């Protein structure tokens, strides 16, 4: 038993809700919140900009030190950093950005990072400003992640299309 509430169950291990991930994180304080990161951990907009704003820019300060030490992530890769006031940990995961011409096959590799964590609160990778089809992203999520994933979908209209079209 865990503290996630109001989710619809899609599969044995995948759950979905219409929610603002920032507010969902603030209330649940999950062990892991996933950020829709880029390779530079520049949290300017989308999910990343919202999460970072909710940390009063502490996520960005920590991220800049991480990059200065380690260099950029790989597309499809991830790193574990602090969850600040939102979660114990933040798993920064880089899905391919279709608006940068990145290979969508890397979306499966991106979701594989979730399997290193028993339970996660997450957005749909490569959705939103990353330019991928959120229905495809949901399919890859279901077919790749084996751990327990609670997906927060900000847009109510999108949440309903994702549910109604789910196979
Ligand atoms: O659902 C959507 O509209 C999109 C799905 C994936 C790409 C961007 C959006 N992502 C999110 N997903 C969950 N919570 C969120 N809070 C947010 C707050 C913001 F200021 C911007 C985006 C989100 C967001």
Swiss-Prot record:
Residues of the Macro domain: 1-167
Effect of residue 164 to L: In strain: Gamma/P.1
Compartments, as annotated in UniProt: Host endoplasmic reticulum membrane
Regulation: Inhibited in vitro by GRL-0617.
Catalysed reactions listed for this entry: Thiol-dependent hydrolysis of ester, thioester, amide, peptide and isopeptide bonds formed by the C-terminal Gly of ubiquitin (a 76-residue protein attached to proteins as an intracellular targeting signal)
Membrane topology (UniProt): Multi-pass membrane protein
Function: Responsible for the cleavages located at the N-terminus of the replicase polyprotein. Participates together with nsp4 in the assembly of virally-induced cytoplasmic double-membrane vesicles necessary for viral replication. Antagonizes innate immune induction of type I interferon by blocking the phosphorylation, dimerization and subsequent nuclear translocation of host IRF3. Also prevents host NF-kappa-B signaling. In addition, PL-PRO possesses a deubiquitinating/deISGylating activity and processes both 'Lys-48'- and 'Lys-63'-linked polyubiquitin chains from cellular substrates.
Self-association and partners: May form homohexamers. Interacts with N protein.
Name the record gives this protein: Papain-like protease nsp3
